[PDB]
Amino acid sequence: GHKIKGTVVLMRKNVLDVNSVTSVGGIIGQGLDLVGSTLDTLTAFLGRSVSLQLISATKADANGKGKLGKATFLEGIITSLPTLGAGQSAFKINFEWDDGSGIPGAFYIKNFMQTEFFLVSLTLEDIPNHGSIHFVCNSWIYNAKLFKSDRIFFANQTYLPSETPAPLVKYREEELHNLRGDGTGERKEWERIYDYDVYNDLGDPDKGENHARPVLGGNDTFPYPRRGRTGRKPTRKDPNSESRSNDVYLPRDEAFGHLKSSDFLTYGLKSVSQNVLPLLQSAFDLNFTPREFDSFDEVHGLYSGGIKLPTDIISKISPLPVLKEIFRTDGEQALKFPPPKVIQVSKSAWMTDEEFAREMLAGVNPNLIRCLKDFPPRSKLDSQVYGDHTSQITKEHLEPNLEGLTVDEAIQNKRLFLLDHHDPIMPYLRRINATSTKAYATRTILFLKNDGTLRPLAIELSLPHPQGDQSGAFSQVFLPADEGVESSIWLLAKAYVVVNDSCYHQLVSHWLNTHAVVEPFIIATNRHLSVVHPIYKLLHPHYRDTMNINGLARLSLVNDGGVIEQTFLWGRYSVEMSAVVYKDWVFTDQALPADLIKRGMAIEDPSCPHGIRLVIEDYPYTVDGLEIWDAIKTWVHEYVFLYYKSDDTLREDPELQACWKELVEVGHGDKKNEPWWPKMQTREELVEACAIIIWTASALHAAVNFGQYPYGGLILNRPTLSRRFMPEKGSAEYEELRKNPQKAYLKTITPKFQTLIDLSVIEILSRHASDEVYLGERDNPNWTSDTRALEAFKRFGNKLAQIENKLSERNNDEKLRNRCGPVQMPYTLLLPSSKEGLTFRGIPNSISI
Ligand SMILES: Oc1cc(O)c2c(c1)O[C@H](c1cc(O)c(O)c(O)c1)[C@H](O)C2
Numbered sequence: 001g002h003k004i005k006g007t008v009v010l011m012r013k014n015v016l017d018v019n020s021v022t023s024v025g026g027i028i029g030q031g032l033d034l035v036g037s038t039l040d041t042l043t044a045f046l047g048r049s050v051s052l053q054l055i056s057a058t059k060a061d062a063n064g065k066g067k068l069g070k071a072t073f074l075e076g077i078i079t080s081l082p083t084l085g086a087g088q089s090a091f092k093i094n095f096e097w098d099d100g101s102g103i104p105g106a107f108y109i110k111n112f113m114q115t116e117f118f119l120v121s122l123t124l125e126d127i128p129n130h131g132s133i134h135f136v137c138n139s140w141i142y143n144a145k146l147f148k149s150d151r152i153f154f155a156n157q158t159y160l161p162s163e164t165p166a167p168l169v170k171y172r173e174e175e176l177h178n179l180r181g182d183g184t185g186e187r188k189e190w191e192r193i194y195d196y197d198v199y200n201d202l203g204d205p206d207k208g209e210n211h212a213r214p215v216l217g218g219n220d221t222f223p224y225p226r227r228g229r230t231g232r233k234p235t236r237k238d239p240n241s242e243s244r245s246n247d248v249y250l251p252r253d254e255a256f257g258h259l260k261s262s263d264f265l266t267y268g269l270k271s272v273s274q275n276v277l278p279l280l281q282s283a284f285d286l287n288f289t290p291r292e293f294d295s296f297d298e299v300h301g302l303y304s305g306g307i308k309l310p311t312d313i314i315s316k317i318s319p320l321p322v323l324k325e326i327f328r329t330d331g332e333q334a335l336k337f338p339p340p341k342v343i344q345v346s347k348s349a350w351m352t353d354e355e356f357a358r359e360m361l362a363g364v365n366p367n368l369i370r371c372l373k374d375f376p377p378r379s380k381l382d383s384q385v386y387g388d389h390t391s392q393i394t395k396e397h398l399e400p401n402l403e404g405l406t407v408d409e410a411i412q413n414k415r416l417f418l419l420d421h422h423d424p425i426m427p428y429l430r431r432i433n434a435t436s437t438k439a440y441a442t443r444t445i446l447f448l449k450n451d452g453t454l455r456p457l458a459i460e461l462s463l464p465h466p467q468g469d470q471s472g473a474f475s476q477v478f479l480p481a482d483e484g485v486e487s488s489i490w491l492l493a494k495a496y497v498v499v500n501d502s503c504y505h506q507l508v509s510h511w512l513n514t515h516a517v518v519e520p521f522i523i524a525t526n527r528h529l530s531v532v533h534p535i536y537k538l539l540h541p542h543y544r545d546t547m548n549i550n551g552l553a554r555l556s557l558v559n560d561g562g563v564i565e566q567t568f569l570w571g572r573y574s575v576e577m578s579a580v581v582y583k584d585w586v587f588t589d590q591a592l593p594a595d596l597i598k599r600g601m602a603i604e605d606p607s608c609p610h611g612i613r614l615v616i617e618d619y620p621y622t623v624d625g626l627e628i629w630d631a632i633k634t635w636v637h638e639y640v641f642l643y644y645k646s647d648d649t650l651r652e653d654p655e656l657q658a659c660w661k662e663l664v665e666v667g668h669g670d671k672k673n674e675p676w677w678p679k680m681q682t683r684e685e686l687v688e689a690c691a692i693i694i695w696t697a698s699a700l701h702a703a704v705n706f707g708q709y710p711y712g713g714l715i716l717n718r719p720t721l722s723r724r725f726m727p728e729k730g731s732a733e734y735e736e737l738r739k740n741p742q743k744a745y746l747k748t749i750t751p752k753f754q755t756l757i758d759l760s761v762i763e764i765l766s767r768h769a770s771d772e773v774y775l776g777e778r779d780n781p782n783w784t785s786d787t788r789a790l791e792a793f794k795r796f797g798n799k800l801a802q803i804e805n806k807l808s809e810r811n812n813d814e815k816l817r818n819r820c821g822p823v824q825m826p827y828t829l830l831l832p833s834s835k836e837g838l839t840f841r842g843i844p845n846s847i848s849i
């Protein structure tokens with residue numbers, strides 16, 4: 001005889017699902033923390049509803065396996081616990097245990113209730129010499145008849161792939177097996193099967209020929225990372241292309257629910273290109289709304305008075321959950337947009353050459369600039385002439401009013417920089433310009449001023465086929481001007497570079513280098529590292545809600561009818577080109593230090609703070625991020641050496657080795673024969689690999705994503721597509737620059753409808769949910785009983801707080817004005833913590849939006 005006491009903490013569906021959470025149109029950071037033991041609806045879990053069965057960790061049966069200790073059904077609700085949270089419900093359960101039937105280390109759970117629930121945790125108040133044994137669950141439990149195998153959950157202690165407790169070695173290998181799933185069938189909602197598949201979901205051949213898109217991945221031309229496998233039948237008119245669907249599968253638990261209504265920022269997107277985009281396209285295709293902005297004064301009226309809309313649309317969008325606040329409205333007829341930080345102090349400073357060069361260092365896309373080593377700039381294209389030629393920017397185009405010295409001197413002293421956007425677009429420039437869009441293949445040189453500020457020198461506007469093709473060097477360079485038509489020409493020359501930059505930032509810097517590249521790691525980790533594994537615990541939080549956002553992405557963002565194809569320059573060839581750029585992606589080069597060196601923005605110097613010397617030290621992104629990357633690198637190292645006693649210990653880890661093999665050969669399989677892949681044979685290799693994953697999921701994504709609306713919320717500052725070529729000679733358009741240069745500008749960039757779609761999308765993306773878990777020492781509960789890892793994590797959070805303070809002081813340092821610029825916008829993109837809204841700060845643990 002004997003009875004172990006258990007406290008089961010769970011959350012009902014009603015507390016976490018959107019359709020029902022339609023009633024949380026307000027602040028619910030708590031609100032009594034309604035236990036459910038309140039307004040007892042929790043008696044339903046009391047009948048013969050839920051059974052738990054403890055499993056032994058120190059006592060095995062006949063053939064290997066651990067030992068089951070009877071099935072026990074729930075009983076009573078514990079109405080209040082000091083550690084009880086909002087939306088949570090707690091239940092008491094006494095298991096009959098007995099020494100000889102050792103110490104528990106896992107448990108099976110059966111849900112008989114039909115409607116699923118979210119199991120939070122289980123805590124046992126033992127018998128032998130043990131304190132409370134805690135089980136961190138955080139998993140949705142569906143009815144027991146549809147699983148073939150019982151849902152099992154392990155205890156707190158993390159064990160290496162030895163799988164340690166012999167009685168649980170079988171239970172560990174089996175759960176992992178179940179996570180993989182054979183690679184067969186159409187995946188269902190309640191399933192937890194992680195598998196790979198190529199990008200063949202984006203297009204829709206059945207609806208036409210114009211609706212087909214190239215298969216990405218699994219070929220030489222368009223190599224690409226794998227995405228989470230879903231098992232829909234092929235498309236009728238194409239067997240290698242998967243049929244579309246309004247509901248895309250992703251393993252359950254990977255789809256995070258929320259307590260508050262406006263925290264479902266994914267249901268925001270899905271509802272915008274669904275019930276906001278179709279309706280708005282009918283407002284333009286009428287007359288209640290002008291199709292083109294007439295002046296600069298009209299674009300700004302978007303944040304003040306807003307776009308007076310008809311009730312035929314403005315009330316059909318008004319209810320819609322999550323879209324609470326965002327789509328401001330004075331009641332009837334008005335779809336207002338909040339003012340971006342870029343125009344709050346000065347609405348005219350975005351036009352300066354300084355807040356153009358400045359944004360390449362502290363902007364939305366700050367990791368593309370590079371030091372010029374040998375002028376003129378060269379193309380990396382093939383036997384196409386200019387790719388064997390170079391840029392047509394003469395040694396005679398450089399050095400204006402600033403200082404004045406030779407070209408070679410400016411290079412030996414490393415003051416000349418480049419912002420090359422030539423290669424990626426050139427190959428498709430013929431096809432793209434043959435549509436409503438008209439773009440250039442841009443190149444721009446920058447000079448490092450004596451006062452640390454960067455200044456534009458020459459902008460090269462290239463076009464394909466000077467006469468035929470094989471040459472492509474049909475370019476023209478433009479120089480900076482301050483008055484007359486020359487300035488209105490230079491203003492447009494910058495608009496041609498930005499249209500290229502925001503699109504490169506679109507699918508590459510943001511979608512490719514972050515979103516797409518990370519998904520394969522989530523799948524490889526879940527398929528091969530047991531939840532009990534140390535590396536699984538270190539990585540886990542940085543994968544939060546990632547397969548969910550990428551699922552929506554394939555559904556509404558980067559698909560055939562998508563939002564990215566309508567709003568961006570590359571248009572229909574958007575993702576294909578990112579597959580082309582992917583050819584150049586190198587894992588180890590994603591490391592911040594290695595990236596800075598590769599672009600020539602830094603030189604190794606041990607005498608310096610982080611082992612590297614920076615050319616242009618007034619580089620916010622780089623300077624701030626180096627502190628953060630370092631913090632990550634120190635934390636992973638402390639953590640990895642905490643578990644691995646030697647290198648051989650790593651090599652003989654079957655879970656990690658099977659994980660790395662599959663990630664290389666399958667996840668990012670198109671690059672399997674690449675030599676730069678770390679060969680998990682060293683401990684500092686695992687350290688590096690984990691640091692790059694975490695950097696990418698948190699700090700890289702934050703820098704590249706949260707400054708989207710603050711900088712690009714003004715379509716003027718960061719336009720997404722160009723429709724006209726540069727006005728020439730005496731044309732009625734050249735003369736229009738003279739008459740009305742603002743109309744000239746507006747007719748050269750994103751039209752009104754696409755401007756309104758762009759803003760409503762990057763505005764959702766640029767916001768933090770109120771329940772976001774940041775890098776700042778943040779985690780949900782107590783993921784491990786390993787006190788040493790607990791302390792190492794506390795140390796991580798501490799240095800994150802010092803760094804935060806450290807970063808604020810730099811923003812106040814009047815000598816580093818590349819942090820603020822003419823726009824007075826303190827670069828706070830890399831500060832660890834942040835509050836709820838559209839704050840221009842905060843580093844989430846992962847790619848959550
Ligand atoms: O989590 C998200 C949310 C999004 O809505 C998007 C994501 C990732 O990435 C791509 C993308 C394209 C762009 O053009 C951008 O500017 C951008 O930031 C991201 C996608 O097509 C739109």
Ligand SMILES: [Fe+2]
Nearest residue numbers: 705765847849
């Ligand atoms: Fe994102």
